[PDB]
Amino acid sequence: PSANPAKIFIRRLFNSGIAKSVVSYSNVMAAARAME
Amino acid sequence: PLQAVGMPVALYNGLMERALEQCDGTPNSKWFVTAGRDIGEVQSKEIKDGID
């Protein structure tokens, strides 16, 4: 489990035990106005 | 599909309404004739009778 190189990022960007949004709000707004 | 076709329809209706209004309102003439003030009171009617 410790062999995963991904540990470089998630210790910096995504603190353990804190849920974070999959996408930014600007992307959601862009998607919403696309349908119209 | 009706979500996204608002602006096209809105512009189409206005563009056709303007055409209808212009058809109804534009004067239907082809000649514009002007004359001086020195023509007489009855001598003037002769000109339009000749043109007519």
Side-chain angles (χ1 to χ4, degrees):
Chain A
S2 60
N4 187 339
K7 65 191 174 178
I8 301 299
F9 305 108
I10 291 169
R11 186 267 182 275
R12 172 183 181 123
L13 299 177
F14 297 96
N15 297 293
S16 179
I18 310 183
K20 291 297 186 181
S21 299
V22 174
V23 294
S24 57
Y25 189 67
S26 55
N27 200 348
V28 175
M29 271 305 98
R33 304 199 322 264
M35 302 310 288
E36 313 203 289
Chain B
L2 285 183
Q3 283 165 180
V5 303
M7 288 207 297
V9 176
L11 180 54
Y12 185 98
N13 287 342
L15 285 177
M16 181 75 98
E17 272 165 48
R18 292 176 70 100
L20 284 169
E21 290 174 1
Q22 278 203 25
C23 168
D24 273 8
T26 312
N28 185 5
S29 189
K30 187 175 284 292
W31 288 14
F32 187 81
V33 190
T34 301
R37 291 190 179 177
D38 208 339
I39 318 164
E41 202 161 295
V42 63
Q43 208 163 46
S44 170
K45 285 189 211 130
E46 279 187 350
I47 286 168
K48 203 185 174 186
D49 287 352
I51 289 164
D52 263 358

